[PDB]
């Protein structure tokens, strides 16, 4: 079965020169091997010169001097640069500058890709580093004309206000939290600037309502907020519009400011329009005029960004490619089921969240991630690291059968001297792996493919695929967003993706939202400006493209768990958010909030390019190519270490050369390899290429990322111009086929200080005597205090920190509790002297209000816990006194059944409730069916006087549970009271038996079979 | 340079049959391949029959039927048993039964080992299961005649008393503690039976002093103590005497009991003497008579234990062997430095011990290991597991360069199709590993070697060595003690080991102590009775061999740390204990106390047979042999899994046979291999060998312990009888060459309850706003309580228990602390409402009495902490106001130097204990007082000076205090914590810079 379908279009990538320029440069067709000579004939190529100019203006100036014949001092460093760019212009399809370009194709019944005469169109635009220099300059002068909004990242925490990264930053301050004080005039500003205010309109209101007299005090105040980016002006362009520069000119035209600058920007816009029409190689002088004019307006290092479009004549591929890729995804998703814990840090974080907050609350995203008021971030987040000493250990738990399979594959490959390992469908089927569930399949993806034709002599589309060095991406659209200004109809592309996303998810519960973010170092944002079609937008440190009706704020995002998976909800909308980011922003370097919102959008989905064998082979210096059918998934690879290569920074060439030839002979390294960083394809039978090799080896300390990969050395290239071959990469986007409380964390209702109506004691060192201490000591003392009316009620339960303890909670007034504490000390000293305990502590009681039904019902649940304590004490005593001889399993079963009977869950439901969560251990059938039958009044149990004692104890608890059950059903705001019933059953088991998960599981199984067998009697 | 020297002697081990009996049974020289005929011929061999009789009387009875010509039921099961025993009699030197024997050799200038005609002596003696079956019967009938002692394993905990393993146990009970109530008449008996007492003398004291009037009450009391083994009778023999049965016959003569039993025991003793005189094979009829006599006295499964001595004529080996083993030990101890954390679980336990008890306390062994009053055992101990939910993840931290070295070795071996990997001294020297220290080299060891002539051509001692399957032992004499009754002069062997141990350790402080333990399942102890020459003995559940002067009791042992290594000490002796166990008792199944005492004796020593490459190759299904010079360190090995042998329990033979022949060719498995369990050497070219293979493989589910190892296929055997080869194994023992408080844990002095004169508050949620919370809020509130005289003093510090918090401690009376608690509540609510904290708790204050000098000086240290808190608040406030602008590093250095100066540690010591203008304290910090900033700083610090001088003089005045520099170091660590919190890097920097500045000032001091 096919799991994915294609979209309407795909991306084509291709370098500017054919492969012939590469082989011809290594003297393929000419005897000359002079160091210069050819070096002059490459610098006479105008397309090579213009490509260098747009990328590195320093290296350009050296090439001019070289053609002038001037002495160039380094020359060594000069050759390395020229060689590396000549290679990168012929061999690396990845699009950058003018070295490589992009185009968009369509699926067809045949493959044909061709170049037109009018190949290569330029798309130049201003760099964001340059634009934002002008924005700051203007608003630093003319702010009285501007309109301001509050920064949507703001968080207000007590008397402090915060932003997600440091602004107006300081080396003495970035060592800790940086914040402004939330003074009353700041809180007034926060309400006025909510949706934009004119500067003069804001100023006079503050001067009015605070009198001040000194006008300069308010000007100085507002300047601080603007300079620290708590206020954002209208001039700053959105990243989500199609043209940031046109936006800025429009805004300065609305303000009617700096009229001389408006003309200069218009002239720059016209010069830039002229430059984009010049063909490649003709633009050199035109670029320098524009670059000089822009440098005269704002002096920054980057100024211009340039892209180019291939402008192909034909651009069709045989849709057969989609049937092949669907085969690959099946085997990879099957293999993904062998890893049991693929995200160990996020999985640990769920346990911390549940232990703090339970299942029934939604928590503010910014509170939750805070170190002081939250639980902090996951332990692998490096922005504001978690300051707690938590355990960082992890294990993904690979299946030992799959570890064996790949190790036998490796051994057989070495023994037979095979350069590749092949996996096969029927070999994987024999592994007996668990099948993937549909909800775990990822909803869209992108894969990068190099395509070569396997034989022209068969006159057929026999294609060989290699997965590209970057593999792909986790969502369709991320690779395309960077080129939205080059697409003919970008809105129609993203509307399709948005429609298919909405089609795959639950209707009416979800809305789509885009995340947009401008970092402090704005060079990084030049790849982060893109179009989108999500309904809502959250724009941080920038103006948004959306109207204020569709604007979202970080302090409005609440996080919850459902089905053990995280979701995000907007409180103002009361909608769940489906979150998108249409660009290749790296999550691991973003602030923790953005990284977390990225992570949870992929929660419980498989990551398709996380390969199982990666951990099996991580220690080998050599790995064969891994392939499936006609896909090469990973290339053949070699790496270098201090054992196999013996190199120092004091080592020298010729000495390295001898040492490296021994490596090539020992490991079989072929003539062509990639050096897997930015140096790429190296020809080893050429001494200048080994000079690149040694310089990298020696900077990389002879180990660091010195990884060699084989070249794609079979098949032939599919893209041709006349007779010249071009190397070509496809990006294929795929979409999944569809298969049919307001109580705050520190409210005084939730958290009770010591002696604030409750005294909460932890008793340590109890494990050897737990049952005698409960049944005798605690029972007598607390039941005496109840009769003297000193306390109204108590309950206890057993827990584990490191070390086991009893938790004992007493309820009264603060006055009465402080009055008796001296007698509690004497009591606990007497217990210690007998050796029954070691030490104790007093703690804050944190009330689980939402779990037991809200602020009304938890008062009744705390009475239910009081009566269940008494019954437990009485059962433990009668058991110790020998008054009956039932096993622990029988007492558990009877207690569970008596709970459901008194809570009022009718028999038709009971079995299904005790299911949904011992077959040969039922062999006591007659005993269990006799005892668990509640009919008449436990008639089968009352048969023996031992059983009569037992039921007369349990019935002390009955009437309060009935009352609690009726109120839970009487409440219309509470639903699935079966979750409340389940919670109180766990606590009774804890009280009687302690922590034993297998024991509790046994009691619930062993009682579903007796209730089932009583079907004929109900 | 040689690290080890030989002892006077070594052990020789040899099977009872020559290897020719193996090849002749697989038709080496025979055309016939019938299963019978040969099956009849071996069953007519008298040595084989008696060997089977001594080991399994069941199978012996089947052999007799088979020779009587009856038809056996199983027959197939009959074949595999006879094959397995014939092979084990021919090929496995490990001594057991009559299958194999032992002898003791001496070193010489040349090797010659030869059998005499008088070979093979029997050494039969009774089994302990039978001895103790008889002992229980007598002490049940005749207890009134016996003398009794307390069980030396006893522990008393509050009102309960406990033993280290369950007695009179119950399957419901064994899951938890089992104990007797320590009632007053028990505590009286515990004093009376200290040195032993007669039953009547004990009974009538108790009856009198408790005036019980009903005599039967005390009888029924003492019977329960005896049945539960809280009392031990004189009849029960020591495991550490030479003959347990002669001891038992002697004690019943002293007691005069049951004289009709005593003559029967004496006659059993006589018949046993005659049996030991019979040659092997001649004894079947005499064994059955003695066996049936003994079974008539006590019916139990085992009854008799038998060994045999080889009685070699010649037994010299060339002393050259000792030089080769020194080379092996050099290269192995060199490799051992590549692993940083080889005992991961015990290192965690050292951290938990430092956390709970610190560096200055000695803790009772049975308290420390207790789950409730102690910290429990290490997390890998299986006898009462640690019930705490700790993280058990562990890592040994192998050096990445050595992993690379071994991985390129393995790749190169597979590529060249080589069957072995060789390690070399110069290759290891290029790894640039750290050098092993002399204190880490283990004091003694034993190594097992199979020895072959590399060739006969020279008639020369060119030897090839294979390390035996069990490798060796951690201590000299562990392999030997099991044969103490067969040695000619056992005391002279064990005396020289004790003397060599006493010579290696520190004089005067140490004594040697033997641990002896009898388990509840006594069959396991038949290998645990041995002689020793240690000065003291601890005997558990048994009588000892020593007088009461030299008896040690388990509740007398205290544990401490020194130099980050554990030691054990006796409180009565006031001596450290050098602990010995001269037998192969497995520590991993012993009670937690015995396992911990074993682990102590090896702490911070290397374990020589823990091979580094064992972790690197653990995932591979084939491994070449690892060798060095002329040692094969590990054999070549293959293992089977569900990928390479697709077999199931439903799989039939023939299909297995075709499946396996494929595996052989793919992996190159040779003709002879060991199946590494109790089936051992297999000839794969023979079909019944394949039947043994498949039978094992099916039960082992095609995975469990199915490891194949190659045979020692080159060289020739060195032991000959005329012209018959025997396989021979040596055990070489070696010894290292020498290179020249009374305050209990729950005393009211130590632990203070909440409001018990101390109020101890932990404040959470504070990490964003420390320094402001200290300098303003805590400062202004607590100092105002001192002015009111509501509290006498306070101090604070910063800690982590996962979450960061402040620890704030206030001192007053209980009545005053309960009176003001409402205002403390109002105070902390206001701090919370500003968002400066989240929640708080009240905790017990556990005072570090021994760290700060004992019960008197601790009261002064707590005043030093009070004045140091005030100075920290003042410095933090002045910094926040900007009254000075020094770096944190400057303030740290000045405070450290001011501490040493005011504590009175002179300059000549300061640079040994650990900018120039500021740290020069001369005149009156005159270089600092020059600026106004420096005058403000120094005036704050001088608030602290007077109390530190007073404290320092009292420390030096108390002659009971030693290394007062540890007190100064402690209080300097606290000052840094208050100002900067927890950052180990920053303090290390601050101290380093201060030392450099003080050293540069030598001309000025």
PDB file of N, CA and C in Angstrom, chain A residues 394-430:
ATOM      1  N   UNK A 394      20.478   8.298  29.364  1.00  0.00           N
ATOM      2  CA  UNK A 394      19.469   7.970  28.362  1.00  0.00           C
ATOM      3  C   UNK A 394      19.824   6.634  27.723  1.00  0.00           C
ATOM      4  N   UNK A 395      18.800   5.921  27.254  1.00  0.00           N
ATOM      5  CA  UNK A 395      18.988   4.725  26.439  1.00  0.00           C
ATOM      6  C   UNK A 395      17.804   4.561  25.497  1.00  0.00           C
ATOM      7  N   UNK A 396      18.088   4.400  24.202  1.00  0.00           N
ATOM      8  CA  UNK A 396      17.042   4.251  23.197  1.00  0.00           C
ATOM      9  C   UNK A 396      16.473   2.841  23.096  1.00  0.00           C
ATOM     10  N   UNK A 397      17.125   1.839  23.682  1.00  0.00           N
ATOM     11  CA  UNK A 397      16.616   0.467  23.717  1.00  0.00           C
ATOM     12  C   UNK A 397      16.359  -0.081  22.307  1.00  0.00           C
ATOM     13  N   UNK A 398      17.456  -0.340  21.600  1.00  0.00           N
ATOM     14  CA  UNK A 398      17.383  -1.060  20.333  1.00  0.00           C
ATOM     15  C   UNK A 398      17.115  -2.546  20.577  1.00  0.00           C
ATOM     16  N   UNK A 399      16.291  -3.142  19.716  1.00  0.00           N
ATOM     17  CA  UNK A 399      16.052  -4.583  19.751  1.00  0.00           C
ATOM     18  C   UNK A 399      17.318  -5.371  19.422  1.00  0.00           C
ATOM     19  N   UNK A 400      17.665  -6.318  20.302  1.00  0.00           N
ATOM     20  CA  UNK A 400      18.881  -7.118  20.136  1.00  0.00           C
ATOM     21  C   UNK A 400      18.876  -7.998  18.889  1.00  0.00           C
ATOM     22  N   UNK A 401      17.706  -8.384  18.384  1.00  0.00           N
ATOM     23  CA  UNK A 401      17.664  -9.106  17.114  1.00  0.00           C
ATOM     24  C   UNK A 401      18.054  -8.233  15.933  1.00  0.00           C
ATOM     25  N   UNK A 402      17.727  -6.949  15.981  1.00  0.00           N
ATOM     26  CA  UNK A 402      18.072  -6.050  14.890  1.00  0.00           C
ATOM     27  C   UNK A 402      19.537  -5.645  14.963  1.00  0.00           C
ATOM     28  N   UNK A 403      20.074  -5.488  16.170  1.00  0.00           N
ATOM     29  CA  UNK A 403      21.514  -5.318  16.320  1.00  0.00           C
ATOM     30  C   UNK A 403      22.304  -6.499  15.764  1.00  0.00           C
ATOM     31  N   UNK A 404      21.852  -7.727  16.019  1.00  0.00           N
ATOM     32  CA  UNK A 404      22.492  -8.903  15.430  1.00  0.00           C
ATOM     33  C   UNK A 404      22.449  -8.887  13.907  1.00  0.00           C
ATOM     34  N   UNK A 405      21.269  -8.671  13.334  1.00  0.00           N
ATOM     35  CA  UNK A 405      21.101  -8.697  11.884  1.00  0.00           C
ATOM     36  C   UNK A 405      22.088  -7.786  11.149  1.00  0.00           C
ATOM     37  N   UNK A 406      22.223  -6.540  11.599  1.00  0.00           N
ATOM     38  CA  UNK A 406      23.165  -5.623  10.961  1.00  0.00           C
ATOM     39  C   UNK A 406      24.621  -5.994  11.212  1.00  0.00           C
ATOM     40  N   UNK A 407      24.922  -6.652  12.324  1.00  0.00           N
ATOM     41  CA  UNK A 407      26.305  -7.046  12.560  1.00  0.00           C
ATOM     42  C   UNK A 407      26.698  -8.250  11.714  1.00  0.00           C
ATOM     43  N   UNK A 408      25.768  -9.175  11.481  1.00  0.00           N
ATOM     44  CA  UNK A 408      26.033 -10.247  10.530  1.00  0.00           C
ATOM     45  C   UNK A 408      26.164  -9.708   9.113  1.00  0.00           C
ATOM     46  N   UNK A 409      25.372  -8.694   8.762  1.00  0.00           N
ATOM     47  CA  UNK A 409      25.537  -8.054   7.458  1.00  0.00           C
ATOM     48  C   UNK A 409      26.928  -7.451   7.292  1.00  0.00           C
ATOM     49  N   UNK A 410      27.415  -6.753   8.318  1.00  0.00           N
ATOM     50  CA  UNK A 410      28.750  -6.161   8.260  1.00  0.00           C
ATOM     51  C   UNK A 410      29.851  -7.214   8.166  1.00  0.00           C
ATOM     52  N   UNK A 411      29.776  -8.246   9.006  1.00  0.00           N
ATOM     53  CA  UNK A 411      30.762  -9.320   8.946  1.00  0.00           C
ATOM     54  C   UNK A 411      30.796  -9.981   7.572  1.00  0.00           C
ATOM     55  N   UNK A 412      29.630 -10.314   7.019  1.00  0.00           N
ATOM     56  CA  UNK A 412      29.598 -10.933   5.699  1.00  0.00           C
ATOM     57  C   UNK A 412      30.157 -10.009   4.624  1.00  0.00           C
ATOM     58  N   UNK A 413      29.910  -8.701   4.743  1.00  0.00           N
ATOM     59  CA  UNK A 413      30.453  -7.763   3.766  1.00  0.00           C
ATOM     60  C   UNK A 413      31.973  -7.737   3.798  1.00  0.00           C
ATOM     61  N   UNK A 414      32.564  -7.665   4.988  1.00  0.00           N
ATOM     62  CA  UNK A 414      34.024  -7.692   5.054  1.00  0.00           C
ATOM     63  C   UNK A 414      34.578  -9.015   4.542  1.00  0.00           C
ATOM     64  N   UNK A 415      34.019 -10.136   4.997  1.00  0.00           N
ATOM     65  CA  UNK A 415      34.563 -11.427   4.591  1.00  0.00           C
ATOM     66  C   UNK A 415      34.518 -11.615   3.079  1.00  0.00           C
ATOM     67  N   UNK A 416      33.419 -11.237   2.428  1.00  0.00           N
ATOM     68  CA  UNK A 416      33.338 -11.386   0.979  1.00  0.00           C
ATOM     69  C   UNK A 416      33.911 -10.203   0.212  1.00  0.00           C
ATOM     70  N   UNK A 417      34.423  -9.184   0.897  1.00  0.00           N
ATOM     71  CA  UNK A 417      35.000  -8.019   0.235  1.00  0.00           C
ATOM     72  C   UNK A 417      33.990  -7.337  -0.688  1.00  0.00           C
ATOM     73  N   UNK A 418      32.808  -7.062  -0.149  1.00  0.00           N
ATOM     74  CA  UNK A 418      31.761  -6.359  -0.875  1.00  0.00           C
ATOM     75  C   UNK A 418      31.812  -4.894  -0.467  1.00  0.00           C
ATOM     76  N   UNK A 419      31.658  -4.008  -1.441  1.00  0.00           N
ATOM     77  CA  UNK A 419      31.585  -2.583  -1.154  1.00  0.00           C
ATOM     78  C   UNK A 419      30.216  -2.106  -0.677  1.00  0.00           C
ATOM     79  N   UNK A 420      29.188  -2.956  -0.650  1.00  0.00           N
ATOM     80  CA  UNK A 420      27.861  -2.514  -0.241  1.00  0.00           C
ATOM     81  C   UNK A 420      27.148  -3.566   0.599  1.00  0.00           C
ATOM     82  N   UNK A 421      26.226  -3.090   1.436  1.00  0.00           N
ATOM     83  CA  UNK A 421      25.270  -3.909   2.178  1.00  0.00           C
ATOM     84  C   UNK A 421      23.885  -3.646   1.603  1.00  0.00           C
ATOM     85  N   UNK A 422      23.121  -4.707   1.339  1.00  0.00           N
ATOM     86  CA  UNK A 422      21.746  -4.578   0.869  1.00  0.00           C
ATOM     87  C   UNK A 422      20.765  -5.161   1.875  1.00  0.00           C
ATOM     88  N   UNK A 423      19.742  -4.378   2.219  1.00  0.00           N
ATOM     89  CA  UNK A 423      18.588  -4.839   2.985  1.00  0.00           C
ATOM     90  C   UNK A 423      17.487  -5.282   2.030  1.00  0.00           C
ATOM     91  N   UNK A 424      16.618  -6.179   2.502  1.00  0.00           N
ATOM     92  CA  UNK A 424      15.578  -6.766   1.668  1.00  0.00           C
ATOM     93  C   UNK A 424      14.299  -6.943   2.471  1.00  0.00           C
ATOM     94  N   UNK A 425      13.168  -6.850   1.767  1.00  0.00           N
ATOM     95  CA  UNK A 425      11.857  -6.870   2.415  1.00  0.00           C
ATOM     96  C   UNK A 425      11.620  -8.148   3.210  1.00  0.00           C
ATOM     97  N   UNK A 426      11.943  -9.302   2.627  1.00  0.00           N
ATOM     98  CA  UNK A 426      11.668 -10.571   3.295  1.00  0.00           C
ATOM     99  C   UNK A 426      12.626 -10.854   4.444  1.00  0.00           C
ATOM    100  N   UNK A 427      13.858 -10.357   4.376  1.00  0.00           N
ATOM    101  CA  UNK A 427      14.734 -10.412   5.541  1.00  0.00           C
ATOM    102  C   UNK A 427      14.174  -9.609   6.709  1.00  0.00           C
ATOM    103  N   UNK A 428      13.630  -8.426   6.433  1.00  0.00           N
ATOM    104  CA  UNK A 428      13.026  -7.616   7.487  1.00  0.00           C
ATOM    105  C   UNK A 428      11.749  -8.259   8.012  1.00  0.00           C
ATOM    106  N   UNK A 429      10.975  -8.900   7.137  1.00  0.00           N
ATOM    107  CA  UNK A 429       9.759  -9.581   7.575  1.00  0.00           C
ATOM    108  C   UNK A 429      10.044 -10.689   8.584  1.00  0.00           C
ATOM    109  N   UNK A 430      11.124 -11.444   8.389  1.00  0.00           N
ATOM    110  CA  UNK A 430      11.514 -12.465   9.356  1.00  0.00           C
ATOM    111  C   UNK A 430      11.945 -11.914  10.711  1.00  0.00           C
TER     112      UNK A 430
END
